[PDB]
Amino acid sequence: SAETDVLIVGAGPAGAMSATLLASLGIRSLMINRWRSTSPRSHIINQRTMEILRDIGLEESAKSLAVPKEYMGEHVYATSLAGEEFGRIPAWASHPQAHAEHELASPSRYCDLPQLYFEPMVVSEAALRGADVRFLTEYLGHVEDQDGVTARLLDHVSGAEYEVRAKYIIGADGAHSLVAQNAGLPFEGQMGIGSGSINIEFSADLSSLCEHRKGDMYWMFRAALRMIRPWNKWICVWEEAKKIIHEIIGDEIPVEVGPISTWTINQQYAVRNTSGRVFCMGDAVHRHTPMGGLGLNTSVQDAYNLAWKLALVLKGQAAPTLLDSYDAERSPVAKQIVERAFKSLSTFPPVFEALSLPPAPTESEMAEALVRLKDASEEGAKRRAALRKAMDATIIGLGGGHGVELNQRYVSRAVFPDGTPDPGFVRDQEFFYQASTRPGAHLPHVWLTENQRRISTLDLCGKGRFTLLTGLSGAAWKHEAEQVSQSLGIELKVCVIGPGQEFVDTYGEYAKISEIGESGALLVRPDMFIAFRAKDASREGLEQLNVAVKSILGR
Amino acid sequence: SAETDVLIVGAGPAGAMSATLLASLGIRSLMINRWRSTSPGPRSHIINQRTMEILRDIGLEESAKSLAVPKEYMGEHVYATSLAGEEFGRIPAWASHPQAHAEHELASPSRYCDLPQLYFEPMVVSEAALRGADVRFLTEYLGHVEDQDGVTARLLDHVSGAEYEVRAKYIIGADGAHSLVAQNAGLPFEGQMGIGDGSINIEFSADLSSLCEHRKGDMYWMFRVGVAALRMIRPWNKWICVWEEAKKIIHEIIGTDEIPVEVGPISTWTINQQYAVRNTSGRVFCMGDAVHRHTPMGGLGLNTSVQDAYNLAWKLALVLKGQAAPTLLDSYDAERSPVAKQIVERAFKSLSTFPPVFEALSLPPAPTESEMAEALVRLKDASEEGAKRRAALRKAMDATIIGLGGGHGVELNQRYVSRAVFPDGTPDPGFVRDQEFFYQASTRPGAHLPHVWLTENQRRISTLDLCGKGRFTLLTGLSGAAWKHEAEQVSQSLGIELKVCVIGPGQEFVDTYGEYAKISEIGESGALLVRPDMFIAFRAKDASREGLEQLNVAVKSILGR
Amino acid sequence: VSRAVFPDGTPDPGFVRDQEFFYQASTRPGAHLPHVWLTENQRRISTLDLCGKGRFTLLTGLSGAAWKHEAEQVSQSLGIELKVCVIGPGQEFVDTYGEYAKISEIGESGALLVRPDMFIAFRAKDASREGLEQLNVAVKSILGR
């Protein structure tokens, strides 16, 4: 037997990130994993995940191993890699305007970094920061009571079974989570919808076909060809029958075949992610197709939302009520993600409609469509246009869904409403991010300066602590904040932004972006979400802070 | 209880590398470690070409390069009063001198780089597990017993609390400098562990780009203990000082209050010069710091530990698969124990290069702020006495370079002599130039395969890239096609893989520059048999039938059959 | 070899290695000034960067401060500009690597007179008065005066 604070079952990206964050806040975690190693899957890393690595100080590492945005831009649709292109779309915000909306949304950027490298990076940091990490250990089951939970583990090295006592359990096993099964969580959706896919990993120098048109992926109508390491290591998606490959490249280039695997099509999510003392996290509560990068990025953000709350509760600085906001804030996102990824598969058939093709067409029918495309008639013009309209529409699954990625709007006991009407979105909320400074939104990024050197507004804010932001007219918040930290037992950094100060807004972006006068203030959560906002530093505003905080923490 | 082929105790660079390589060759390893994680502490960071070659064989080179600081940022070693104070002078460290750099480029396709063991370790531990090794941290080796069929060790699990047994065919002791595995195996050591009356390592953080970016180096040494060092961990930003808020010893070393400083952990180093005279004791093989414990002068610790693992894995693999007799494992001691003694003696001897600096300034060791100040102004003196002092100091400073990148020979000039190299009946050449300072390429058996550039599809490839992959390789020119057939016969005959490359104009690999012709000391029809670990075990002048007959014998001999 | 180089009495060394394939730095008059790295403000500067600018330049170490005064006297005397660089630990221009010491075939107090076109016209072993007297002659001679 053994005792710890939190038991994390699973060391995929969500469990690992959970361990890292709990270790960074002084909480004892034991992380476990049935398998011998990290996953040998996902690869698009979006801005929200990069911001979190930036908060933890792992951003520079990930960028070192990741392929940059500049190499991810050209999505090509073709007959084969060596054959003729139907056309290209500007993927992963490579279009100048998409890129601008990208830059303004965050200090971080897209990059490609196979889960294969990501996982061990984070598992090793978690152990470095203080988490205990044991692989080849299988969760068999648990029982809860009023004071905590006891789980039974099976050790695949020693052979022994032993018990672990813990105050909480995080179910971060994968898409077949036994932890979710035992906690009794309800799911909606199915796990094999219809055709799945076959994933042939392989190696081959394709620089001559790719360096003049750099992209993350190359899709063929005849299946996908995705880059793992620039122009060199690859998967094909669809034993020496894997010269299906030669067909997809379109013999001349030598090829070593790696492992092959199978994917199914899923659309299932948990309606509720918590069940007294058990919290479930990543693929365990949202299982979906790969369309859009959303799986890994959502999983890490699940862990970022929960850690700080658990920490606070385990230290008596907050009431267990606070843990309910994990479900309120995070379950919607899971449903959203699952529905989005599936819906993104509908954007492909319309490509065949534009070529007048049935699905699974035959080499003849294809060949006809290709020459109709080259036709100098008005019928051929219509086709050309139809194909364009169709191809452009696929972009939602391929970098255009910026709104889905960033426009979280939490509503829970952990955000204190300011009395403002919910504004909607001016533009489409799946395609476009809308910065909001209203409570429940994520803190907008703008550039300030510290010592004439650019710093993001987000760099003022993480570090496992609440932060409160203001201008010079709002010095009063400094004193009001100290009083509240003293009164309730919690850290509360206060930044006064302006001309004299450490942080100044040399560009006026902070003034422009907040929807609020200089003397107003934003209370930012450890997870970077705004929990409270005041118009000004009036005494009515200043009295509210202390209440907002007691309320947020359940006290 | 549990069973596995090899039990590796320790997950420092040698144990981890061992696990990776054995997993890559299809061998079941369990690697264990007392601690909760990889080494956090300030330890090794200079990665030399031999270690980079090995990563290049394993395909981890591009990863390490991504996280490592390049050679170009490592060049300026400055000696000064303080970082903000006045420089006594600079030497061109880590082969930054144009000529040192040429000798570097020619010696290998790889390059120096700085990568804190802190990142190196987890890189390799995760690859080992990915390639098939079982890896368990928080597990302590308590002891073992051997017999005729293998070994049984007792382990203590610090998570579950349980003790259990592990049965294995062999054990690799890669715990550190206090190896309990070495103690139980009964290995003999020579040398001591605390030589005199050591060093304190203060980790800290602070943006020093204004003081360093115009003169990029790995280290900045201060004469002020007489001496203290300031080493870069992440370019201009994360640091250790070497020598609780008394750690503004630091402010003294930087020489200013103005730059804000966050203090990290502090630790202590001692001066060691101790190595094992013998690294093997029936069925137990000891590996890194466990058999060579020494000071940090020259980068040699980590690099030697990884190469210990590269020498052994393939041999263990062959033996465990019945392709080789247990005799082959004796060459680990023959080939590797000398290098341990060499490394330890070199690192310690590199500390003698410092006192002569004080002699050149007429200073006693541990001088006082006044005496120092006098020496500085004598140095600036427009007299002939002052000229002599200047020159003395130069002669002294230059001599320290052996510990700071000049020891290229120590790094690369291994010459194995063991049952695992088959002599060709060439006279031993010596070294034309100093064998500590200068690498000498040799193609004679027992030497490491030289690097030269060939082309595959008009693209440069190293001779070394034809050669690892856990297998023996045989190299030749077109006049030597006969070796192809002879090689097949021997692979069929004994049960082992044996790649053959015929280098030339028509072929896959060609030597577009003539470097292969120039470098081998051998005619086109001759051949080199290269080991998995990149060392030449056999060489033939030509492809005559007398030469061709020998191959089969050399191979049966090397493998003990 | 011409009236515009003042021989220092040193035998011509030859070339150790083939003179078509390999450069040999020399500091003997008639040769081109060798390059080595010095520092100005801890930033690398070439020895050649001390030296052009349409003017004669004279190079020395600290033990050679006497050349500063001697040089001024000669500029005043004949009507020409003559920069003087004293290379060393205190100064503008220091040889942080010791290359200057290593490369010149000359003690610290010695000096090299470099022509506008970067060729050495005069070299002195040291700053003795016999050496210092020569400068004025070397210069009159070089200019035909």
Side-chain angles (χ1 to χ4, degrees), chain A residues 9 139-143 149-151 168-173 176-187 270-271 273-281 284-285 287 326-327:
Chain A
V9 175
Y139 163 84
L140 301 168
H142 78 271
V143 301
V149 304
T150 295
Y168 296 104
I169 292 180
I170 290 179
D173 20 27
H176 296 93
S177 161
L178 180 51
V179 174
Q181 228 184 239
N182 295 3
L185 303 177
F187 289 80
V271 181
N273 64 17
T274 308
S275 179
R277 270 184 197 285
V278 177
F279 298 82
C280 290
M281 210 159 263
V285 305
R287 20 259 207 175
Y326 175 64
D327 179 82

Side-chain angles (χ1 to χ4, degrees), chain B residues 74-79 89-94 96 215-221 354 394 400 404, chain C residues 97:
Chain B
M74 299 174 67
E76 310 291 354
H77 195 95
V78 349
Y79 286 121
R90 301 179 190 171
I91 61 164
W94 309 112
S96 71
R215 44 168 192 180
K216 305 182 168 73
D218 187 55
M219 268 171 295
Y220 296 87
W221 290 45
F354 297 94
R394 200 68 246 179
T400 72
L404 301 167
Chain C
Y97 310 92

Side-chain angles (χ1 to χ4, degrees), chain A residues 48-59 61-69 71-83 85-143 148-160 162-166 168-169:
Chain A
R48 284 254 183 286
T49 309
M50 288 307 296
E51 287 159 354
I52 293 160
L53 299 180
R54 192 192 178 81
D55 192 19
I56 300 324
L58 299 200
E59 192 195 30
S61 290
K63 284 165 78 192
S64 284
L65 302 166
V67 165
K69 199 170 191 301
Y71 282 51
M72 299 173 68
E74 308 289 356
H75 194 93
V76 347
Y77 288 117
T79 49
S80 72
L81 192 60
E85 306 179 3
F86 298 110
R88 301 178 191 175
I89 61 164
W92 308 112
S94 71
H95 187 274
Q97 187 65 56
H99 177 69
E101 288 143 12
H102 201 73
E103 272 183 316
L104 297 165
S106 167
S108 299
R109 308 288 179 256
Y110 266 136
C111 67
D112 184 306
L113 180 73
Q115 180 158 351
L116 184 68
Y117 315 139
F118 189 97
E119 272 184 44
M121 210 160 71
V122 183
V123 169
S124 74
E125 193 67 27
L128 279 161
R129 271 144 131 129
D132 299 336
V133 178
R134 199 170 228 56
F135 282 51
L136 295 168
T137 293
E138 188 180 5
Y139 163 84
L140 301 168
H142 78 271
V143 301
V149 304
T150 295
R152 210 176 323 118
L153 309 181
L154 168 56
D155 181 334
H156 287 271
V157 171
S158 78
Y162 62 105
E163 304 211 315
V164 189
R165 182 71 184 173
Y168 296 104
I169 292 180

Side-chain angles (χ1 to χ4, degrees), chain A residues 1-2 30 36-40 61 64-65 116 120 124 126-137 155-160 162, chain B residues 1-2 30 36-38 40 63 66-67 118 122 126 128-139 157-162 164 459:
Chain A
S1 59
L30 169 68
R36 164 181 50 76
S37 80
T38 63
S39 274
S61 290
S64 284
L65 302 166
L116 184 68
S124 74
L128 279 161
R129 271 144 131 129
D132 299 336
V133 178
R134 199 170 228 56
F135 282 51
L136 295 168
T137 293
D155 181 334
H156 287 271
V157 171
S158 78
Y162 62 105
Chain B
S1 59
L30 170 68
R36 164 181 48 76
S37 80
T38 63
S63 289
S66 285
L67 302 165
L118 183 68
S126 73
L130 277 161
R131 271 144 131 129
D134 301 333
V135 178
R136 199 170 229 57
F137 280 52
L138 295 168
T139 294
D157 182 334
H158 286 270
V159 171
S160 77
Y164 62 102
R459 302 247 188 170

